[PDB]
Write a protein that binds this ligand. Structure first.
Ligand SMILES: Cc1cc2nc3c(=O)[nH]c(=O)nc-3n(C[C@H](O)[C@H](O)[C@H](O)COP(=O)(O)O)c2cc1C
Ligand code: SF4
Ligand code: SF4
Ligand code: SF4
Ligand code: SF4
Ligand code: FES
Ligand code: FES
Ligand SMILES: [Zn+2]
Lengths: 426, 210, 106, 263, 88, 78, 23, 45, 27
């Protein structure tokens, strides 16, 4: 439900206030049962996540255990690998920036705890190029850990071998995709591959590979070291566990709090963070999972709590759980319009739907903000939207269509008036 | 996306990794599996950018040589990513985040202030070559929606006057306290932490026999 | 108006011509542009059906309002590109009025 | 017998494991409309003009890259797989420059046909088109690349048949331009095949620029005498002079390709 | 842009096609009502005078006028010419 | 890349003189059977027609592409 | 921090990294 | 040479439905004045 | 708001063939 206890808050060093470095980490006791866990077995680790029923902490939601289970199949003579994507291009995902800037070890032991679960030879962490600062913090942390012998061959005084590496991103949101990151590592252009060859079977350097949101890798060790069931209790049904929530825009105290999942949307701005700037009635709309997920208008805001099942009932996605809030002084139409501008400046262009479709919606959306376009065009953008939604090679085209669909779904009268406003002044 | 050879930006310019740089080069390679030096392109191309911001056609060709890859390969990587600059950026490259999260926090409000202070249009270098302003997209520090990235400095919660203090510090002197401004630090509920105030539970706590 | 022939040798001009009357062999004109070196109607095969004026995407070939062009010989009816272009350099004051008069209905 | 059984609108053909959904339709005899998929070129999935709907399945799959599985019935003429083509063709055409009476791949266009058979009667793109900058790739290939549908066939051929990796994609977004970043001519034998392999008329042959138009060309099948491989070729003659020689497929000798000399 | 059609006809005529096929089993090789709602009784060449006489002089099928007689030539078929008699 | 024009067997005749009309430069011909391309549906039915009419034939066997195995992942191996 | 510090950290963690497989 | 401000320009052939099909020309390089393949009109960026 | 100017056709075609011109001086 809500009011996650500090005693249950995984990322204790959030907000810093501790030594993100190892000695702070030791007081955190992050490396407490690592040898034991690995000793227990890879099968024991996946039992822990299956019991946890953790969902993907990245924009896509899938059982974390089943995804890791897939490349637990016997090696075919190719080294298995771990890829941690610290890229978070999605607006409002400062969620991950926290775990690299702070509590970097949380992720380092997440990597080896996760590594033996998939039997990965090594893990590469792709941080956003922008986070040069963040990249500096982690390898200082990674360097500490090996010096200790926590990672490396015979890591944590155990038979198992692991090596952790950090890879420089280069300002691309699409590099965040499950497969495209792999291609970026491989050194080719960051263009996603098709799903038929699933990442596990075909991978980074053509070997089995798996990709996890940094939050997903980070919570593993604590979910196993601590009781996974313990975590499970926090979640709701399929939904489970605490996921960091970032609230940004039109709220009195924008902040990232790792409060519990399944939180009433009205409650998290009202109780933690900062109540919606201007009052809870000054809420034109809420973007729950970030730019990719459709915004939900106030009417439904207070009604649904934050969890992926509840949101999909609501037609929106928990995604990165980045809450972007809009007051009534905003231009709903120009707000979403810049997100389509966010996607035309960013989609790879590999696939026909997304390439021309996202540019086509950008042109129509800019006209919509001006009000130059006629009212009949508004549903035509509906139809352009679903052509892009099911036909794209990756999910970004999936993502571009949803905000457009949300604007037409709940704010169709406002766009018509902008249509009307321009027609009147001629 | 076409490199029309120009006396300044052309193959004529000689590029070569400093003895120190070449060293760095190798370090990167080994990170990748053997015989996969190809992957070194992005990281290496980045060090060519570290060497020189311009990174001219000559520099890319050099990268191809070092990693043994086909030049077109490197050319494709440089063009795809915004991080690499194929034109001479200014000494201080100021990038203002203007995605919706920041906009709603008047990120644009920052823009107008910076254009006037630099006294220049958005997208080009100052005559002084001192600063270069560009309207970049989300930088991943939405919590502090007002935000500008100055050569990694990554400042935040910036207000016209805040940027004012910052731009003056860059123009005279250096290292202008890069980071947030209001003192909200990184993602602190401004009013109060409201959480994590309780002391760390300590190692062992909650193990619950896993 | 500028003075540039409108025909860009699409060969559509003669594709639909059912009487099989038109041969428009073309080249790049040495400006880099695209124009005819050859154009033809055998006016003793044409049927005045206007399938060439409605297919032309540029309004180059038209079918003018002449009907006093009888000839004492057979050779004066096999029009070439220069008996059609100076022909069109004749009636353009009289054609364009009718195009502008019927363009909407077409 | 590792044949696996899969249904093409019911014909229930049996195919080797690992055949693509597009390939399954071919043996029944159906043709998936396709761009960016060439039999002897790697599958890329760029166009996604081949989206089909396997049965009782949530979304449309790419017939070029999806390995057909056991007992999936492909529905190639469903009400969905036609909205998956009526809506893609909307996009390819939206940024396309209308100069079909310039494009000498007039009747030789795999993009007007598929528009003219599987696409849409009208247009809804009331906005502004894009334009790219014509560059010089040589004296044999005229790249009026504002025509390009970014299908990456050229990039692959240049890299998998001819080993000349000079061509490549540059830039992202709608701005992706498929060409040679610096202007270096595409000089190699096997060069002219790009013309034949680009379904769009973006880059076409410069000598045969505007001498003809394909419906007129009478096509006589003959043999290559310039080189001793004896590549099969089709000599396209109009009114009695040869206008172009393009390859005709011989599995064993020239499988759809001919030399720069003999063309 | 989809023809305004009557299904009554398809059925009524289909039924006549079965009637003619039953009345003349010896000469009719295939009867089919096309989707253009027209009927075609294909007869062995020997049935040309029998089949047409039955249609010209039968109370339940009077086909008094010969609209036309024409012969499509499909060169492939062994019997190339396909004489076709349209009756009203 | 359309394969709908490579499915039916055609019987075309030899190519004789195509010359130039002195007056207008058009292509002229005296081969009455020049524009003739009969279309059959099988080798058997074309040989039959030619033999039927007394022409000499030069049958050319069909050349269907053989099956070439294509896989997306293959280009990702190293 | 400086432009070369991130890569120098990599320069340093080279030894830390054990051998890498070869295809 | 038709001077223009925009990177790309149209060329309906000086008419709507009375001129030539409408194509957008990229006057992006002063090095070359775009020439609509239909009118042969050079445009000077 | 008898004549000598009679249209005569051409073959406006640029002759579409080129014969070897024999060598000017003998050998
Ligand atoms: C355009 C695009 C951008 C993405 N960016 C990110 C990202 O920055 N971070 C991230 O964790 N996942 C991102 N994803 C989702 C990944 O494809 C993948 O599903 C996810 O990283 C898996 O993490 P999880 O399984 O631990 O949730 C992106 C997906 C798309 C289509
Ligand atoms: S006349 Fe009109 S149609 Fe005939 S070629 Fe010239 S342009 Fe094409
Ligand atoms: S009018 Fe004369 S020329 Fe124009 S199409 Fe009909 S017949 Fe051919
Ligand atoms: S390619 Fe040439 S022909 Fe095919 S559509 Fe585009 S323009 Fe018309
Ligand atoms: S050029 Fe022809 S082949 Fe190369 S991409 Fe553009 S269209 Fe596809
Ligand atoms: S939008 Fe500027 S911080 Fe993400
Ligand atoms: S043809 Fe299937 S992906 Fe383009
Ligand atoms: Zn023009």
């Amino acid at each position: 439900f809500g009011s996650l206890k500090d005693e249950d808050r995984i990322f204790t060093n959030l907000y810093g206030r501790h030594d993100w470095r190892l000695k702070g980490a030791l007081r955190r006791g992050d490396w407490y049962k690592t040898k034991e866990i690995l000793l227990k077995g890879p099968d024991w680790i996946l039992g822990e996540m299956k019991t946890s029923g953790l969902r993907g902490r990245g924009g896509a939601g899938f059982p974390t255990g089943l995804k890791w289970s897939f490349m637990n199949k016997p090696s075919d003579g190719r080294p298995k690998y771990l890829v941690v994507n610290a890229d978070e291009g999605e607006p409002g995902t400062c969620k991950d920036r926290e775990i690299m800037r702070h509590d970097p070890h949380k992720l380092v032991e997440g990597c080896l705890v996760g590594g033996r679960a998939m039997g990965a030879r090594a893990a590469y962490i792709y941080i956003r190029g922008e986070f040069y600062n963040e990249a500096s913090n982690l390898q200082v942390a990674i360097r500490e850990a090996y010096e200790a012998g926590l990672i490396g061959k015979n890591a944590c005084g155990s038979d198992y071998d692991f090596d952790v590496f950090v890879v420089r991103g280069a300002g691309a949101y699409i590099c965040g995709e499950e497969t495209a990151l792999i291609e970026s590592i491989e050194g080719k252009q960051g263009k996603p591959r098709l799903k038929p060859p699933f990442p596990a079977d075909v991978g980074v350097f053509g070997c089995p590979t798996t990709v996890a949101n940094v939050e997903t890798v980070a919570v593993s060790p604590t979910i196993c070291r601590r009781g996974g069931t313990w975590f499970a209790g926090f979640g709701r049904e399929r939904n489970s566990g605490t996921k960091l929530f970032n609230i940004s825009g039109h709220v009195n105290h924008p902040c990232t709090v790792e409060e519990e999942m399944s939180v009433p949307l009205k409650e998290l701005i009202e109780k933690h963070a900062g109540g919606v700037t201007g009052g809870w009635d000054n809420l034109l709309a809420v973007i729950p999972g970030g730019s990719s997920t459709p915004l939900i208008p106030k009417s439904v805001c207070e009604t649904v709590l934050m969890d992926f099942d509840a949101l999909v009932q609501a037609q929106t996605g928990l995604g990165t759980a980045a809450v972007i809030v809009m007051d009534r002084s905003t231009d709903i139409v120009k707000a979403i319009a810049r997100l389509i501008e966010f996607y035309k400046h960013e989609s790879c262009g590999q696939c026909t739907p997304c390439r021309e479709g996202v540019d086509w919606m950008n042109k129509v959306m800019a006209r919509f903000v001006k009000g130059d376009a006629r009212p009949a065009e508004i549903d035509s953008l509906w139809e352009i939207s679903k052509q892009i939604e099911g036909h794209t090679i990756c999910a970004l085209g999936d993502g571009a269509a949803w905000p457009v669909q949300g604007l037409i779904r709940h704010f169709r009268p406002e766009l018509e008036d902008r249509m009307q406003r321009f027609a009147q002044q001629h | 996306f076409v490199h029309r050879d120009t006396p300044e930006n052309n193959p004529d310019t000689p590029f070569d990794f400093t003895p120190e740089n070449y060293k760095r080069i190798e370090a990167i390679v080994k990170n990748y599996p053997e015989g996969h030096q190809a992957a070194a392109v992005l990281p290496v191309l980045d060090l060519a950018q570290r060497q020189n911001g311009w990174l001219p056609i000559s520099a890319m060709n050099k990268v191809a040589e070092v990693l043994q890859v086909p030049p077109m390969r490197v050319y494709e990587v440089a063009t795809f990513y915004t991080m690499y600059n194929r034109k001479p950026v200014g000494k201080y490259h100021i990038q203002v985040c203007t995605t919706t999260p920041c906009m709603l926090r008047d990120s644009d409000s920052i823009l107008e202030t910076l254009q006037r202070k630099l006294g220049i249009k958005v997208g080009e270098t100052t005559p002084d070559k001192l600063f270069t302003l560009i309207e970049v997209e989300c930088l991943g520090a939405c919590v502090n929606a007002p935000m500008v990235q100055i050569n990694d400095n990554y400042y935040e919660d910036l207000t016209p006057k805040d940027i004012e203090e910052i731009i003056d510090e860059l123009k005279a002197g250096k290292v202008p306290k890069p980071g947030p401004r209001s003192g909200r630090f990184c993602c602190e509920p401004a009013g109060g932490l409201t959480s994590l105030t309780e002391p760390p539970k300590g190692p062992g706590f909650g193990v619950q026999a896993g | 108006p500028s003075g540039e022939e409108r025909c860009i040798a699409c060969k559509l001009c003669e594709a639909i011509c059912p009487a099989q009357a038109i041969t428009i062999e073309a080249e790049p004109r040495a400006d880099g542009s695209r124009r005819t070196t050859r154009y033809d109607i055998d006016m003793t095969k044409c049927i005045y059906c206007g399938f060439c004026q409605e297919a032309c995407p540029v309004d180059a070939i038209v079918e003018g309002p002449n009907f006093e062009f009888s000839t004492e010989t057979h050779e004066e009816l096999l029009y070439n590109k220069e008996k059609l272009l100076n022909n069109g350099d004749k009636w353009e004051a009289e054609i364009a009025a009718n195009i502008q008069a019927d363009y909407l209905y077409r | 017998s590792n044949l696996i059984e899969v249904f093409v609108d019911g014909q229930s053909v049996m195919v080797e494991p690992g055949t693509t959904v597009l390939q399954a339709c071919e043996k029944v005899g159906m043709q998936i409309p396709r761009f960016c998929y060439h039999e002897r070129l790697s599958v890329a999935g760029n166009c996604r003009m081949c989206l089909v709907e396997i049965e009782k399945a949530p979304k449309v799959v790419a017939a070029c890259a999806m390995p057909v599985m056991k007992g999936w019935n492909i529905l190639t003429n469903s009400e969905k797989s036609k909205k998956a083509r009526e809506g893609v063709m909307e996009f390819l055409l939206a940024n396309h420059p209308l100069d079909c009476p310039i494009c000498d791949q007039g009747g030789e266009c795999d993009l007007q046909d598929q528009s003219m058979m599987f696409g849409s009667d009208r247009s809804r793109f009331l906005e502004g088109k894009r334009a790219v900058e014509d560059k010089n790739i040589g004296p044999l290939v005229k790249t009026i690349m504002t025509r390009c549908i970014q299908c990456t066939r050229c990039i692959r051929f240049a890299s998998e048949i001819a080993g000349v990796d000079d061509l490549g994609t540059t830039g992202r977004g709608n701005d992706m331009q498929v060409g040679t970043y610096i202007e270096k001519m595409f000089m190699s034998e096997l060069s002219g095949n790009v013309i034949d392999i680009c379904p769009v008329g973006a880059l076409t042959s410069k000598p045969y620029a505007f001498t003809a138009r394909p419906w007129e060309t009478r096509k006589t099948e003959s043999i290559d005498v310039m080189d001793a491989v004896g590549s099969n070729i089709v000599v396209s003659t109009r009114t009695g002079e040869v206008m172009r020689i393009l390859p005709r497929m011989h599995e064993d000798i020239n499988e759809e390709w001919i030399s720069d000399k003999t063309r | 842009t989809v023809r305004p059609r009557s299904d009554v006809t398809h059925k009524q005529l289909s039924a006549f096609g079965e009637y003619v096929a039953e009345i003349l089993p010896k000469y009719v090789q295939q009867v089919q009502v096309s989707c253009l709602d027209e009927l075609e009784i294909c007869i062995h060449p020997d049935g040309v005078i029998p089949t047409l006489t039955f249609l010209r002089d039968h109370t339940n099928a009077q086909f008094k006028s010969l609209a036309d007689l024409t012969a499509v030539d499909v060169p492939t078929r062994q019997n190339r010419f396909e004489i076709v008699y349209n009756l009203l | 890349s359309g394969v709908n024009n490579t499915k039916k067997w055609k019987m075309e005749f030899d190519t004789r003189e195509r010359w130039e009309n002195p007056l207008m430069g058009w292509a002229s011909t005296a081969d009455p059977l020049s524009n003739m391309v009969l279309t059959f549906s099988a080798k058997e039915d074309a040989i039959a027609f030619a033999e039927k009419n007394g022409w000499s034939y030069d049958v050319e066997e069909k050349k269907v592409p053989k099956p070439k195995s294509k896989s997306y992942g293959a280009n990702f191996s190293w | 921090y400086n432009t070369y510090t991130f890569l120098d950290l990599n320069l340093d963690l080279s030894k830390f990294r054990l051998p890498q497989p070869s295809s | 040479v038709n001077e223009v401000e925009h990177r790309i320009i149209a060329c309906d052939g000086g008419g709507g439905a009375l001129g030539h099909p409408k194509v957008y020309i990229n006057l992006d390089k002063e090095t070359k004045t775009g020439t609509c393949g239909y009118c042969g009109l050079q445009f000077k960026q | 708001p008898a004549t000598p100017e009679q249209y005569v056709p051409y073959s406006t075609t640029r002759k579409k063939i080129h014969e070897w011109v024999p060598p000017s001086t003998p050998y």
